[PDB]
Structures are given as C-alpha cells and as structure tokens.
Amino acid sequence: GSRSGVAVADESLTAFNDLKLGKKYKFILFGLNDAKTEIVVKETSTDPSYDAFLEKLPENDCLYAIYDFEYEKRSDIVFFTWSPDTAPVRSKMVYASSKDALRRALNGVSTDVQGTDFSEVSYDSVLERVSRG
C-alpha cells in the first residue's frame, strides 16, 4: 500500500449523504479508480427495481454498493461488497484491502452484505438480513 492508503473521494461521500438524507439516489455503485488510490463513484441510479440493480453488478469484477433498501414503509441503508468468484484474484484482493476505507467513512449503514454470487445478493436474501433484528 501507499503511505496513506486509499482515500475516499469527496464525490463518494457527497453521493452517500445525498442518498441517505435526500433520497436523491436509490443506489450508488462505488469502485477503485484505475490508479488504485481513491474510491470513486462508478454510477448512481434512481431505478426502483431491484432487478435493475442486480443487472448492473459485473459478473466478473468487483465493486462496492450502497442501496436504499425499501420494504413494507421502511428504508434501511445496505452496504454491499461485490466480489464474485470469477473476478481476478488481484482484483478481489485489492477490493478487500480497500473496503475498510470506504466502509468506515459511511455512517448510518444498517446492514452489510458480502456478495460473492447472485444468490447472496437477492432481494429476499437481503430482506432476511435487514429484517432479522
């Protein structure tokens, strides 16, 4: 790692706050920049469909996500690590090494999901996690 390690980009925190407090986005996808020095916003979305979210997860690459998980009204902020088994090993490793920098910067997450396949991130699987407590 570098001396300071990966930073969370200002835009990532701004987007998170806009979702959390403003409902500006339904979800945010975050990733490492190509320099592997900052966690940046890959994409935001206002699509209410959980399938539209799933359909944006790269089948063979990693990301992080925040989802405003709504169910009956309740709204819980869910953090995902997305690290599918078919992603390259060095990518899984750097996403794992960098996760804490983002995750510790985001206040107000209710539930975490360690997504390694599509079953683990299904709506019903996430509902079970958010609901249990």
Side-chain angles (χ1 to χ4, degrees):
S2 65
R3 169 178 175 262
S4 70
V6 171
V8 179
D10 290 354
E11 62 165 17
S12 294
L13 294 187
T14 300
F16 176 70
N17 286 336
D18 284 341
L19 177 151
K20 175 171 65 158
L21 296 181
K23 290 198 93 82
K24 185 180 177 72
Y25 311 118
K26 182 63 167 173
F27 67 87
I28 307 158
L29 306 182
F30 306 89
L32 284 158
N33 63 359
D34 288 336
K36 307 295 210 278
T37 59
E38 296 198 12
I39 295 170
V40 300
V41 174
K42 289 185 109 75
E43 188 171 0
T44 66
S45 180
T46 54
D47 197 315
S49 167
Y50 199 81
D51 282 347
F53 167 68
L54 294 174
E55 291 164 12
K56 290 183 186 297
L57 300 175
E59 290 177 10
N60 312 296
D61 208 355
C62 301
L63 57 72
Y64 315 107
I66 283 284
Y67 198 92
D68 184 346
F69 194 84
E70 302 178 277
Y71 57 108
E72 304 182 37
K73 305 272 177 176
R74 302 186 268 294
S75 163
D76 294 333
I77 292 181
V78 181
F79 181 87
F80 292 76
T81 62
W82 179 246
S83 183
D85 300 320
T86 48
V89 177
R90 62 196 177 283
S91 190
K92 294 185 278 193
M93 291 176 167
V94 72
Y95 272 83
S97 78
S98 308
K99 182 193 79 81
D100 287 345
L102 179 59
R103 183 64 182 79
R104 288 174 62 90
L106 306 183
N107 291 102
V109 172
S110 81
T111 294
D112 287 70
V113 177
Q114 189 170 311
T116 70
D117 67 40
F118 282 94
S119 79
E120 291 174 341
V121 296
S122 74
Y123 185 93
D124 290 349
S125 287
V126 176
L127 177 62
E128 187 190 75
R129 291 195 175 274
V130 167
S131 289
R132 185 175 171 81

